């Protein structure tokens, strides 16, 4: 990261500081990385965090300087499309099935999160153009 990048990242980090001490929680590190353009898994976030225990994940606070190596480590289309073609052959996917798999397998999200990202992308039949949805969520 260059000075400009370090300045933008520090400013963003400070936006996530909800206590004024210039720090975020470990549990916010993933959120900051995603807000800054990274897409780490929760497992990857915990790994770069050092697999913290519940107590320090929920209450231990870290400044930008300790977060930065973690952001670096996390930072360092056709597969995504085929991944969506998994759930396809008319180019559509049921909204119910995508909702079920996103809310029941893997690193489960909330139903509200899934509704939020899926809001406006399904038609009256309940089908999502997945090439468009993928481009949209990658934009």
């Amino acid at each position: 990261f260059n000075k400009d990048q370090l300045e933008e990242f520090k400013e963003a980090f400070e936006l996530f500081d909800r206590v004024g001490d210039g720090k975020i929680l470990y549990s916010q590190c993933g959120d900051v990385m995603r807000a800054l353009g990274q897409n780490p898994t929760n497992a990857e976030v915990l790994k770069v965090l050092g697999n913290p225990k519940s107590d320090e994940l929920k209450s231990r606070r870290v400044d930008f300087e300790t977060f930065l190596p973690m952001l670096q480590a996390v930072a360092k289309y056709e597969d995504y499309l085929e991944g969506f073609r998994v759930f396809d052959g008319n180019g559509k996917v049921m909204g119910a099935e995508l909702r079920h798999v996103l809310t029941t397998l893997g690193e489960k999200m909330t139903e509200e999160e899934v509704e939020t990202v899926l809001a406006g992308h399904e038609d009256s039949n309940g089908c999502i153009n997945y090439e468009a949805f993928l481009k949209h969520i990658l934009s």
């Binding site: 897409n39 998994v86 893997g106």
Partner: protein, 747 residues
């Protein structure tokens, strides 16, 4: 290797024969870190592997061949889940239907369901007994060869309840206007009372094979039925082990000894008579025999065997009991006599209507005669007692055969029987703490009937193999003929038994020695325990079984001196007794040989017919409805041969899939770039990429044939791929979400 973190395994346990476990960290080459549902870790040890667990799509299925690990725990689990969570009481395993006694009344047998099942093919439906009766009825309609349904298990398991509904099904679908539905079930109390007995381990065990033909005319109307019986254990009449009883009828009599109808029979209590006292257990808890006698008489009267015949039968049975009390004074090694006024014989002669001096002369002596001259010869007290007990067994077996003939006399119709469907109830494989000649014969019969089952299965799967153009060499007939040759054939265990029956001063000790001399190191299936010279062990079809040689020969001996029969045929007093005898070598033949013959008549009835199989399983001792003791059920599943059938099937190609159903599942496991306009060629290629192709699984014309594990392996890779894709897409969406919350702050 399939074992990984978050795999699952079963582990052995006393209190459920298997327990679920999850593999907590990957195995590589000696002790396994396993999470248990009762505790976060306990560790498991690998010695001179634990059985893997089937994936969730496979479990709970309608057919135990659809499973991919053919394991005792998988069988037990599928039965437990279907019985408990779905209240599904019928299950398929290969050809067999497995029935698990709901042991509770259920609304399953109504007309609408009969009309649902009629017209279906076997695989079209979730299993039910109607799906067997229909499979028989259609093949009778299709073909000349008529049909037989075999039903196996402990008698408690509800075989009568199976036959009841099979008959109701035929009677409803036939379009018949007859009424065998009532008369057959009305016969059951008498056929139990004469033919059913309390065993050490179970109440009301049936001790004979009961075969009901259902007759059809050329129009497939039900015209009537014909009952037969086979394999009756005559020897129970005169002998028991501790805490058994002989056949119920004798106790139903000894409870009615008070009643005005039976005064002249001079019955005592059940300890007064040598045949009833031997068991040491007159009472069965919760049953008045005195009441069951009423149902028995009402069933006789509803079959319409006359009040006079009924009083004759009961007076014969009292006769037998009084006979068994007669006691012999030894005069010499080669002579015995009956004391001068002996009351039991004095009463027996009055019940049978015979002269005391002729019974007393013939009971102590035998007649030998070449055509020129005849000698009347005394005999030892031992031989006179053996002759008495063999007469009591002969009178009983003939009475049983006569009562069954009056049943058929009520059951036949004058209409011509064009074809029949048979329903066979027969006892399951039997093993206790202590095993005797009775168990030995029951197990030999089950060895025969399992040989037949293995034939039928092997033949039908060679048909299915050629219907799919798959080569017959792949299937192997697993063959128990080396055990039958051990029991059945000359110099076998029964033949050497009769040989010491006839050899002078034979005994159980010298017979056991003759066994060891003949089989001990010579055969793989025959073994001797270290500590005892009075037992032997057979590596028998369901299990090793130890048979205790104490008193076979006493049970096996049967000989009847014709003079003692002919003295009874001399009775003027009453019709029945001469009727029994009317219609030689048979009197010389031993109990074992008579059984071996009755078994051949059974097999040559069944081998002429198309089998269908049902198995019945008892979930628990306690009559708890819809609860399932894993300890009990695993024993039943062993005794029914179900587990050994499944272990025979795992050696084959257990799992079969239609190409488009396989593609419908495993498209995820494929990529459209690879896939082709023919599904068969597409799957032929993809699956040959995914597995070692040729030996490990095979392609038929219409179906794909896997060895056991390999479907689970496909489900494993499919699931892990699907999860990885899902996780990547949702982490992308989480990054989008936190970008959206940054927009919220911008908003």
């Amino acid at each position: 290797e399939l074992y990984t973190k978050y795999a699952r395994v079963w582990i052995p346990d006393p209190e459920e024969v298997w327990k679920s476990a999850e593999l907590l960290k990957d195995y590589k080459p000696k002790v396994l870190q396993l999470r248990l549902e009762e505790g976060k870790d306990l560790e498991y040890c690998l010695d001179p592997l634990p059985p893997l667990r089937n994936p969730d799509i496979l479990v709970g299925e309608n057919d135990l061949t659809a499973l991919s690990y053919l394991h005792e725990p998988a069988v037990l689990h599928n039965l437990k889940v279907r019985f408990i969570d779905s209240k599904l009481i019928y299950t398929y395993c290969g050809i067999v239907l497995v029935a698990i006694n709901p042991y509770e009344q259920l609304p399953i047998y109504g007309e609408d369901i009969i009309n649902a099942y009629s017209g279906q093919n076997m695989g079209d439906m979730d299993p039910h007994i109607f799906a067997v009766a229909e499979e028989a009825y259609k093949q009778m309609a299709r073909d000349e060869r008529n049909q037989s349904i075999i039903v196996s298990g402990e008698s408690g398991a509800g075989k009568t309840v199976s036959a009841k509904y099979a008959m109701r099904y035929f009677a409803t679908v036939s379009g018949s206007a007859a009424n065998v539905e009532e008369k057959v079930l009305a016969s059951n109390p008498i056929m139990e009372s004469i033919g059913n007995a309390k065993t050490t381990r179970n109440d009301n065990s049936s001790r004979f094979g009961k075969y009901i033909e259902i007759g059809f005319d050329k129009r497939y109307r039900i015209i009537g039925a014909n009952m037969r019986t086979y394999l009756l254990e005559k020897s129970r009449v005169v002998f028991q082990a501790e805490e058994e009883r002989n056949y119920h009828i004798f106790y139903q009599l000894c409870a009615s000894a008070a009643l005005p109808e039976f005064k002249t029979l001079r019955l005592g209590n059940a300890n007064y008579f040598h045949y009833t006292k031997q068991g040491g257990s007159p009472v069965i808890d919760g049953i008045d025999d005195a009441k069951e006698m009423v149902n028995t008489r009402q069933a006789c009267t509803l079959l319409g065997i006359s009040d006079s015949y009924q009083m004759g039968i009961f007076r014969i049975l009292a006769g037998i009991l009084h006979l068994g009390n007669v006691e012999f004074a030894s005069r010499d090694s080669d002579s015995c006599a009956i004391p001068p006024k002996h009351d039991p014989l004095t009463i027996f002669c009055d019940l049978m209507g015979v002269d005391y001096e002729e019974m007393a002369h013939w009971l102590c002596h035998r007649k030998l005669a070449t055509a020129t001259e005849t000698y009347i010869k005394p005999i030892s007290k031992l031989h006179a007692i053996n002759a008495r007990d063999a007469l009591a067994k002969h009178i009983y077996a003939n009475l049983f055969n006569w009562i069954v003939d009056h049943v058929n006399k009520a059951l036949h119709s004058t209409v011509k029987q064009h074809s029949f469907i048979g329903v066979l109830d027969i006892y399951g494989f039997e093993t206790f703490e202590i095993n005797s000649f009775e168990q030995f014969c029951i197990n030999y019969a089950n060895e025969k009937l399992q040989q037949q089952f293995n034939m039928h299965v092997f033949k039908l799967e060679q048909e299915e193999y050629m219907k799919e153009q798959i080569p017959w060499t792949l299937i192997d007939f697993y063959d128990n003929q080396p055990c039958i040759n051990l029991i059945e054939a000359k110099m076998g265990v029964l033949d050497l038994l009769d040989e010491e029956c006839k050899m002078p001063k034979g005994s159980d000790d010298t017979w056991a020695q003759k066994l060891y001399n003949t089989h001990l190191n010579k055969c793989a299936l025959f073994e001797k325990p270290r500590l005892s010279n009075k037992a032997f062990i057979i590596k028998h079809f369901a299990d090793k079984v130890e048979y205790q040689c104490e008193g076979f020969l006493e049970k096996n001996k049967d000989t009847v001196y014709e003079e003692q029969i002919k003295v009874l045929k001399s009775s003027k007093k009453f019709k029945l007794l001469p009727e029994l005898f009317q219609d030689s070598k048979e009197h010389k033949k031993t109990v074992g040989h008579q059984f071996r013959n009755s078994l051949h008549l059974l097999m040559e009835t069944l081998n002429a017919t198309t089998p269908h199989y049902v198995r019945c399983i008892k979930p628990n001792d306690f009559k708890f409805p819809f609860t399932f003791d894993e300890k009990r059920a695993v024993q039943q599943l062993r005794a029914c041969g179900v587990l050994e059938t499944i272990r025979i099937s795992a050696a084959g190609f257990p799992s079969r899939w239609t190409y488009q159903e396989f593609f419908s599942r495993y498209r995820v496991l494929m990529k459209q770039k690879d896939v082709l306009s023919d599904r068969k060629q597409t799957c032929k290629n993809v699956l040959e990429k995914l597995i070692l192709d040729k030996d490990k699984y095979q392609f038929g014309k219409t179906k794909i044939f896997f060895r056991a594990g390999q479907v689970a392996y496909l489900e494993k890779i499919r699931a892990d791929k699907l999860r990885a894709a899902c996780i990547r897409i949702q982490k992308t969406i989480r990054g989008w979400l936190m970008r959206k919350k940054y927009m919220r702050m911008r908003r």
